[PDB]
């Protein structure tokens, strides 16, 4: 079973450089090409370039010739993409893909910003034969926040909304769930909020008021 494991999300300052990695497993790394693709939020796919790990040879899209540098380390089965002189236009998800189009990495989110990391505040959206309840995750930076319910045991009827950018420059999101009204007195409902950039982990119990 083949896997292309990419490095984690990066929050990087304007004018600096960032280097993302793509680690191959389950196949002979040096026998296949590695391509890099850019996806801006809510936008399409753009091709950056390609490298042959078994020779060191590269080809770039002219739009990324100045900005990007593709390398590969045969010893650690890893491909790297370095982006220089970072701007907000570089904020995107970057994917590595093995030649042939079948095998893709999971993507690496890059946010280019001078703003500070900030953890969210989590507030209950208390319920009043179906009840709606939820959690409001307010004022965090950067993205992402993940939300689960009852430590992953509750998945049916959950909607976790895409975050919105507030006028303050901070993000906010809500996650809701509909459940049987008859369960409000017998079942504990907890939203598990995780904001990795600020190490925030909140497990908010949502009680009927």
């Amino acid at each position: 079973q083949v896997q292309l494991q990419q490095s984690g999300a990066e929050l990087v300052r304007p004018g600096t450089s960032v280097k993302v990695s793509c680690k191959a497993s389950g196949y002979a790394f040096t026998n296949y090409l590695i391509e890099w693709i850019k996806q801006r939020p809510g936008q399409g796919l753009e091709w950056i370039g390609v490298i042959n790990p078994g020779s060191g040879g590269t080809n770039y899209n002219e739009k990324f010739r100045v900005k990007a540098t593709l390398t590969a380390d045969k010893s650690s089965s890893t491909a790297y993409m370095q982006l220089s002189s970072l701007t907000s236009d570089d904020s995107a998800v970057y994917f590595c893909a093995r030649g042939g189009g079948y095998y893709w990495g999971q993507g690496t989110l890059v946010t280019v910003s001078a703003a500070s990391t900030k953890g969210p505040s989590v507030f209950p959206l208390a319920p009043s034969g179906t009840a709606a309840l939820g959690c409001l995750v307010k004022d965090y930076f950067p993205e992402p926040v993940t939300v689960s319910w009852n430590s992953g045991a509750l998945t049916s009827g959950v909607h976790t909304f895409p975050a919105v950018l507030q006028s303050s420059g901070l993000y906010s999101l809500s996650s809701v769930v509909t459940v049987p009204s008859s369960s409000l007195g017998t079942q504990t409902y907890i939203c598990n909020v995780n904001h990795k950039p600020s190490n925030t982990k909140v497990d908010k119990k949502v009680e009927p008021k």
């Binding site: 399409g44 091709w47 080809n59 189009g101 505040s121 959206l125 208390a126 709606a132 975050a163």
Partner: protein, 218 residues
Amino acid sequence: DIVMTQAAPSVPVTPGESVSISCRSSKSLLHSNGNTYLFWFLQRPGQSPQVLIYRMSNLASGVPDRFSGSGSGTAFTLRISRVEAEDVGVYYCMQHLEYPYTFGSGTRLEIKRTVAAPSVFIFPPSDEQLKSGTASVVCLLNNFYPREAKVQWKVDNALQSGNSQESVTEQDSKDSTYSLSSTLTLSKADYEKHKVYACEVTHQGLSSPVTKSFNRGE
């Protein structure tokens, strides 16, 4: 470069029916070896792209027989028969005949289901948030179709403007609905100068707008 054009940004399809997604190229993708270098990819929300078709007409391993590709060298069609609710996502074409490799702008597949009015719920700000000096009033519109839904806020029956923000989910892969949240943000001091908070919802499945409300202090 070779320009890839996808003429339809979205295409609606009732489940069980077939659909065609078009792509065009500014140069023939036919190579002198006889192959036509065109891929079709699917991208589901929050996931990496996945290959459906390689070399214009070859079905990729693990892809259902309901997907097929064909084309002329400059015009291509991805055909999906017996479309399932699970087929929601964005379909992209890509050329790999010459560098730089280029993609089409994507075509979203929208599942046409029965029109459904939203279930509307309103949440007052929590006492926890009020202590911090801010108030967020949330209006939930649940499991509706189509995507288009207008939300208007009224405070003491006065129409609000400039103080709300909405977020909509991707079309559900099982029931083909959308959900929306609207958040009205006030300071605690301004929140406490008013009594009645209401959200009024306009949607194709409603004959007249629906209002959910609460009285502050109840």
